[PDB]
Amino acid sequence: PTLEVYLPQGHSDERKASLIDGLTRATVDAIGAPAESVRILLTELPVSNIGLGGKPTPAALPVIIAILIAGRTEAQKEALIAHLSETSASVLDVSLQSTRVMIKDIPNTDFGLGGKTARALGR
Amino acid sequence: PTLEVYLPQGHSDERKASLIDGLTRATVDAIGAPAESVRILLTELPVSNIGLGGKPTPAALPVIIAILIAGRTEAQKEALIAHLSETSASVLDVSLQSTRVMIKDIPNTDFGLGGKTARALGR
Amino acid sequence: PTLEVYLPQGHSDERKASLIDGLTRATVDAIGAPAESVRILLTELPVSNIGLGGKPTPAALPVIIAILIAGRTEAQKEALIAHLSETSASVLDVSLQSTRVMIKDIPNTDFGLGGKTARALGR
């Protein structure tokens, strides 16, 4: 899985490291991907770049995009949403109500690793 | 500019075309890019893939990611947020409060058009 | 490196496999990353979801977002833009002018591999 977290500026490097740690544990528990297959990118944004209700504010975040190879059940995705959301809210110290998760399913014909498709590789 | 717009599934081709037109006009008015440089990409997600507060629901959307070459002023970005949010809410018939906009700036050395960097093209 | 590629719906599985093959080779040639580290995420969109100049058209694509851990030089990123656009245009049988590439440098404090920061892994 590839996770991208939109978050505001100002969080310490140790907190970002603790977020990467928790989101990986969250993904392993939720959908069973091996820890080593979880890649995370944090996309820090200045407040000028963040909109909620049409106004600039860091309260619009966090937004987590999770990209998965197709095949996960609705139950797994529900658990992924719950775990990523709770982890993000607890580590970043914000309300669970403020968290957003969006899951992209990628067909195995549309995923590449090392130049071969996931379907070519058995996934 | 390149806008990725996350929507729940179900909207008609007409409504998507109305959203494509309105968000293109909103971008032109707010930051002044030529209409022909505005790309609108609608990503539709199943409700199973969309999380708000840790729970699956279409109410987490719309989320607009606006990818811009770096250089837009804070005031231009605030107008982009305002215009994209009002247009999204009106065309989709959803609360303005539910809308989210994230602006990702790309250094001119990191942005490509027709195989050349933006910095090499004078942007 | 991870490439998120937006392309019009409907290309054959063979064409998508060749795109993954070509774009991986393009990335290796451009920045010297090991092919084994290049991941590609193709996101197909129907023409009704794809706007350029405010109207639905496949000419709004291809858009390639390249996610890289920070540290690549401007010259390497320029080469990456040239190679991905070249190969995109060729495999998709589309004008070079229409290709778009956005590179997203991720600070090593902000990138996670298997629950550890890229910084902690010496990258």
Q: Which amino acid is at A10?
A: G
Task: List the end-to-end C-alpha distance of chain A, in Å, as a whole number.
Answer: 13
| Catalytic residue of the set A1, A34, A62, A107 | A62
What is the widest separation between alpha-carbon atoms in chain C?
Answer: 46
Number of other residues whose CB lies within 10 A of the CB of residue C96: 15
Task: State how far residue B38 is from chain C, nearest Cα, in angstroms.
Answer: 6
Q: Are the beta carbons of C99 and B115 separated by less than 8 Å?
A: yes
Query: Chain centroid to CA B99: how far?
Result: 11
Q: Which of C87, C2, C75 lies closest to C43 in space, CA to CA?
A: C2
Q: Which amino acid is at A100?
A: R
Query: Chain centroid to CA C42: how far?
Result: 9
CA distances to B32, B44, C20, C39 from C51, in Å: 17, 14, 24, 26
User: For residue C8, what are the contacts with CB-CB under 8 A and spacing of at least 6?
Assistant: C44, C45, C46, C47, C50, C58, C61
Q: Could you give the 3-state DSSP secondary structure of residue B104?
A: strand
C-alpha to C-alpha distance for A85 and A64, rounded to whole angstroms: 8
Residue ranges making up the domain that contains B13 = 1-123
C-alpha to C-alpha distance for A39 and C68, rounded to whole angstroms: 12
Q: Count how many domains chain C has.
A: 1
Number of other residues whose CB lies within 10 A of the CB of residue B34: 10
C-alpha to C-alpha distance for B37 and B67, rounded to whole angstroms: 12
Q: Could you give the 3-state DSSP secondary structure of residue C122?
A: coil
Query: Chain centroid to CA A96: how far?
Result: 15
The alpha carbon torsion through A54, B39, B92, B10 (nearest 10 deg) reads: -140
C-alpha to C-alpha distance for A22 and A28, rounded to whole angstroms: 10
Residue C91: both structure tokens together: 């495999």
Q: Are the beta carbons of B45 and A81 separated by less than 8 Å?
A: no
Strands C2-8 and C63-69: antiparallel
Asked whether C8 and C63 are in contact (CB, 8 A), the reply is: no
Resolution in angstroms, to 1 decimal, for this deposition?
1.8
Q: Are the beta carbons of B67 and C102 separated by less than 8 Å?
A: yes
Q: Which of C32, C25, C123 lies closest to C69 in space, CA to CA?
A: C123
Q: Are the beta carbons of A112 and C2 separated by less than 8 Å?
A: no
Residue A48: both structure tokens together: 């000028």
Expt. technique: X-ray
Best mutation target among B48, B84, B97 (most A Cβ atoms within 10 Å) is B48
C-alpha to C-alpha distance for B68 and C92, rounded to whole angstroms: 25
Mark whether A62 is an active-site residue: yes
| CB nearest C99 (choices: B44, B110, B114) | B114
